[PDB]
Amino acid sequence: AQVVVSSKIDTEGGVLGNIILAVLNQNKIETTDRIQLGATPVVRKAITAGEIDIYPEYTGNAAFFFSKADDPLWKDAAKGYEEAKTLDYDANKIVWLAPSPANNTWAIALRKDVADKNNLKTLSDFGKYVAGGGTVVLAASSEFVNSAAALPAFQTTYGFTMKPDQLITLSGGDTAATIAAAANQTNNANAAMVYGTDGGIAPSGLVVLEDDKHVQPVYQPAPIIREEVLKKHPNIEELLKPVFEKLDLATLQDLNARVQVGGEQAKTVAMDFLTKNGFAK
Numbered sequence: 001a002q003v004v005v006s007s008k009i010d011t012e013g014g015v016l017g018n019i020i021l022a023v024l025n026q027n028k029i030e031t032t033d034r035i036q037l038g039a040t041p042v043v044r045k046a047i048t049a050g051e052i053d054i055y056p057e058y059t060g061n062a063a064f065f066f067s068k069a070d071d072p073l074w075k076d077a078a079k080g081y082e083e084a085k086t087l088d089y090d091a092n093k094i095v096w097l098a099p100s101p102a103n104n105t106w107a108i109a110l111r112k113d114v115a116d117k118n119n120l121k122t123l124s125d126f127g128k129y130v131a132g133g134g135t136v137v138l139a140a141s142s143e144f145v146n147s148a149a150a151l152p153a154f155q156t157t158y159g160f161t162m163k164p165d166q167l168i169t170l171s172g173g174d175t176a177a178t179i180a181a182a183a184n185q186t187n188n189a190n191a192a193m194v195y196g197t198d199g200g201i202a203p204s205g206l207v208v209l210e211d212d213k214h215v216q217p218v219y220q221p222a223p224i225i226r227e228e229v230l231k232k233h234p235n236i237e238e239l240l241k242p243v244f245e246k247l248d249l250a251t252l253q254d255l256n257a258r259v260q261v262g263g264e265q266a267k268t269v270a271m272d273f274l275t276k277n278g279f280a281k
């Protein structure tokens, strides 16, 4: 029986799904390609119904699957991973394999020139800079500026507030527009609302600030696999471990950018990543 590989329909799903596919093929596990099948609900329905076997899911998404969206545990990367793994095994006999360290969550990215000049690496650094009178204009969605769990939470935890003249507020939630604003200094923008592994970040010369006090839930991608399929191919676990360990934030940003900015096929990007790191030939 072929192992059915899938993913969510977004760019990163295509990248991670093709990475899984290629690792399996290189290690002589035959596959069926159902990559980029649909949105999260469609892919969840498919794996629980046994229509797909393995795909990349994010730790923090388990908060929504298991009716725990309001639980603070998801903001702790290790706790979130363990809770996702335990619940999906107990409820669904789905096995979570080793995660990537990349946190693909709501974030603030700064222009690299501003970050370098002011030695800003973390949101704590950013709060100190803003509170002290540092020059900032942040491009963000109305939802990000106003929803309790977003900018307001960052402001409270990191000790800063943003004035109206320090914000470019857009109606929609697409980070394409906010990334571009900061990249181009539109209306003096030097910061953008992003998700951590957004492909646009790499070529736009922005850098994601670390959420060092853990305000946002953590979304680490990991391959997850139906137990019965893993039992048939038990080496899948160890084969994917070093591969996902190498997928740090900047590496994933770059791979995503190759697809969504460079126009490369995800299959090609995945194979190049594996060959470069000794996981394929």
Ligand SMILES: [Cl-]
Residues within 6 Å of the ligand: 101, 102, 103, 247, 248, 249, 250
């Ligand atoms: Cl990382």
